[PDB]
Amino acid sequence: KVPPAINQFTQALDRQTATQLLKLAHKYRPETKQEKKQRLLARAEKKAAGKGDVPTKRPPVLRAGVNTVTTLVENKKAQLVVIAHDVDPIELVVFLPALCRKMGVPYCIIKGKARLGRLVHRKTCTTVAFTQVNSEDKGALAKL
Amino acid sequence: GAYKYIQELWRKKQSDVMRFLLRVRCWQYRQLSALHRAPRPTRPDKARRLGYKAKQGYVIYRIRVRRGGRKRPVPKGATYGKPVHHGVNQLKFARSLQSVAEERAGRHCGALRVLNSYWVGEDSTYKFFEVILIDPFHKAIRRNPDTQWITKPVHKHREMRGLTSAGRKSRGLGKGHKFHHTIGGSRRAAWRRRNTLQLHRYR
Amino acid sequence: APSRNGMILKPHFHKDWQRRVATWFNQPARKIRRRKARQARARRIAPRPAAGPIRPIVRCPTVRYHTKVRAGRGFSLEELRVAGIHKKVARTIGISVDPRRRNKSTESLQANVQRLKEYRSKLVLFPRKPSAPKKGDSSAEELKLATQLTGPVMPIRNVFKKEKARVITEEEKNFKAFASLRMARANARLFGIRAKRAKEAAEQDVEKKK
Amino acid sequence: ALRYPMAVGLNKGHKVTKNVSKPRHSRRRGRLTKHTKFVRDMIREVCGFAPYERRAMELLKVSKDKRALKFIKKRVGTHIRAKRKREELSSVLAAMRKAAAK
RNA sequence: CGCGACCUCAGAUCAGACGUGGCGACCCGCUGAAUUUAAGCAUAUUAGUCAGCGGAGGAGAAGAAACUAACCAGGAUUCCCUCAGUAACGGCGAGUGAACAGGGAAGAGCCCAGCGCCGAAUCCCCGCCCCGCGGCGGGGCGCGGGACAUGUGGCGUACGGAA
RNA sequence: GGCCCCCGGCGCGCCGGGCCCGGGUCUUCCCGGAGUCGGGUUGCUUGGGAAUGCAGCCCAAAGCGGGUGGUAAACUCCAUC
């Protein structure tokens, strides 16, 4: 018998619901390699044109690492949290759903750490979170 | 901070994850070696807290040790000598099981230098430690001035000499009125200078 | 196997004590070595003071020596703060610092730091360049002169009061000293038990006021 | 009679003005914080209690405190810790009953 | 079934690196007895010593206090004088035995994790182009490959810090 | 004291890399190291003695907390890290 805080990790999402979640994310993934470099170089060249530098607005994007996700959850700046269900030491995110329950932050248990990895250039990411999204997609967010 | 939650969790006990994932080692140290590399520090809490960074060049070896007293090795267990130096049942070794494990892993893997270790499980007749090890000849480590002290050869194999937090305790080393066995730097130095005569050139 | 005395001594380990020191024939050679090393480093850092940092005046521990002062470890942090010197700068301008030292009478700074700065401007912090644009100040006292030597250890031991001839006043004589000492000594030792039995008396002295 | 400086017992000044000081920053370590207490009080309910805590809670349920204390002492060791720990076992049992009758 | 990830886990005369072995005067971690002494003898003493094992360096271990103190307070480590054959231990017999204060030699301070903020801002490898090149580095072209969201770099560590 | 060779030497002149960073006052926010300390028990060791240090096994935490204040214990102040 697994304990309650472990058995919570087995009622993962419905596949098609996860598919809407991911298709939503793929318009939001952060900047990967060979994109970072080109955007930054073009921005360096926009410096001489006074239209863009490193400091300028970035539209809302993902927040991957566990430390960052937990920080913004406990500051209640999260509107959606995803959680990979198969994490090597389960104690990494055994507490997390309880935190989301404490602060009313929506959270979901998806299958696979590999998918969250594909959501960046990295190989795996324990969690991701939408803090805010583009208004035009706010409703599509809110339904899910 | 996530690591605060992890810390508090490991501080607490009476959850079965230990029982689940201790067998995951007791079986595999008997399927594969009793001393084998792990690919990730199972407690990224404790590894980092001891001093660790997943930068390239860092290893952990998880190792089993067998626990108990230490029966004095003599033929048929009857030791010749005056009868206070008998006794082979209840003897107790003079270093922490953690330290024994540390030195076992270190002596097994040359070219890797110890940094510390920590506990991951204890079944009934065992102890499941793991050791953080540095590769002192990888450029990704040697080009980092914060931690290159491991490069220089004064620390060649720290663990047998006993400089690491695992075996330093057994040195009886400390500060105060509770350590006058070692007020010279070592249990042997604080002796060898206190039981020398002292003959000046003028008496 | 005695005849008059009864005194016993240490040097006997039946496995020898010979195997420990006899060599003190170093002593003159060691003196030469350490003296030569001091010559060397005092030459290498020429203008900086011989014995290095200033040390602060402190009053020693237990009753046996609580009347004389001496050079402690270093200046403390709150006394430096009231002196208005940053901790990271004091050492560069050659002042000793040991934060572990709590202070309960900042008797040091009043003279020590102001006098030290006065001497430092008698012979100034040399500017970091021969031209002194705000990476060195008040070089006027190397423009005047320097010490082609240093000042050896700064003075620490000179203080006793003056003790004048005052005529005796009457109440001093009428004061009784041995009685004072004995009775005030017995007071503090009896202090607690008096409190206990005062409480004891008050218990019935108020239950009979109920 | 005419007052003269002699220090009775333990003093921290009988002749010198107590020159002021501010508390050092190493003595501050130990007190909680609004965030750390929060972390403690959430992980506590996430995990649960140890068997020795639960047994003492049941013995406080039957309310024989002079046996609950002995149970906590014989397991943790120091009467200081047992005294300070029975208080935390209460004020949690109290919360349980108070929020059940609610 | 098939494809593709992550995870675990394998072989390779794969690419580049590294360790063993000696000496042992001094140093460090273990093990560690008996002659002998008490006129006998086992507790003690010889002794945490010789023998045994492992591990280094030009010195090693120590080291910035979970310290001393009880004072009008000192303030990391080591070494010398001294405290002192003293406080204590002991078939309280033989014998064993420190420290703190004081005067000196020398003198020095510091760094992570954690909590935080900064667009992973970090690092390694490989191809090549320029200086150098018997301690393999400096710049640069790499729309080269990889580690790292299970935490790299900048700030900062109890002497408070940050905004 | 003289001559001739190779390796240092600290300043200078010169090129080039990268480094823009401090101090005060006021308001606000943050602040720590677990099967570890600690308790018990058995051995060893120590001048440490109702147990100095170290281990093995059993127990096993709290954070105005923890450790120490040389006789075990409860209460209560105070000092010290």
From Swiss-Prot, chain A:
The chain holds residues 75 to 218 of 266 of the full protein. Component of the large ribosomal subunit. The ribosome is a large ribonucleoprotein complex responsible for the synthesis of proteins in the cell. Belongs to the eukaryotic ribosomal protein eL8 family. GO terms for molecular function: cadherin binding; RNA binding; structural constituent of ribosome. The gene is RPL7A. There is a cross-link at K23, K51 (Glycyl lysine isopeptide (Lys-Gly) (interchain with G-Cter in SUMO2)). This is Large ribosomal subunit protein eL8. It is found in: Cytoplasm. The modification N6-acetyllysine is found at K23, K143. Component of the large ribosomal subunit. Interacts with CRY1. Interacts with DICER1, AGO2, TARBP2, MOV10 and EIF6; they form a large RNA-induced silencing complex (RISC). Its main location: cytoplasm. Keywords: Acetylation, Chromosomal rearrangement, Cytoplasm, Isopeptide bond, Ribonucleoprotein, Ribosomal protein, Ubl conjugation. The lineage of its organism: Eukaryota, Metazoa, Chordata, Craniata, Vertebrata. It comes from Homo sapiens.
From Swiss-Prot, chain B:
PROSITE patterns: RIBOSOMAL_L15E. Its main location: cytoplasm. Residues 164-185 are annotated as: Disordered. Pfam families: Ribosomal_L15e (PF00827). The modification Phosphoserine is found at S33, S96, S99. InterPro entries: Rbsml_eL15_core_dom_sf (IPR024794), Ribosomal_eL15 (IPR000439), Ribosomal_eL15_CS (IPR020925), Ribosomal_uL23/eL15/eS24_sf (IPR012678). Residues 168-181 have a biased composition (Basic residues). One of its GO terms (biological process) is cytoplasmic translation. Belongs to the eukaryotic ribosomal protein eL15 family. Component of the large ribosomal subunit. Interacts with IFIT1 (via TPR repeats 1-4). This is Large ribosomal subunit protein eL15.
Swiss-Prot record, chain D:
Residues 8-30 are annotated as: Disordered. InterPro entries: Ribosomal_eL36 (IPR000509), Ribosomal_eL36_sf (IPR038097). The modification N6-acetyllysine is found at K61. Its main location: cytoplasm. It holds the Pfam family Ribosomal_L36e. One of its GO terms (cellular component) is ribonucleoprotein complex. It is found in: Cytoplasm, Cytosol; Cytoplasm. It comes from the Eukaryota. Keywords: Acetylation, Cytoplasm, Ribonucleoprotein, Ribosomal protein. GO terms for molecular function: structural constituent of ribosome. Residues 12-30 have a biased composition (Basic residues). Belongs to the eukaryotic ribosomal protein eL36 family. Component of the large ribosomal subunit. The ribosome is a large ribonucleoprotein complex responsible for the synthesis of proteins in the cell. Component of the large ribosomal subunit. This is Large ribosomal subunit protein eL36. It comes from Oryctolagus cuniculus.
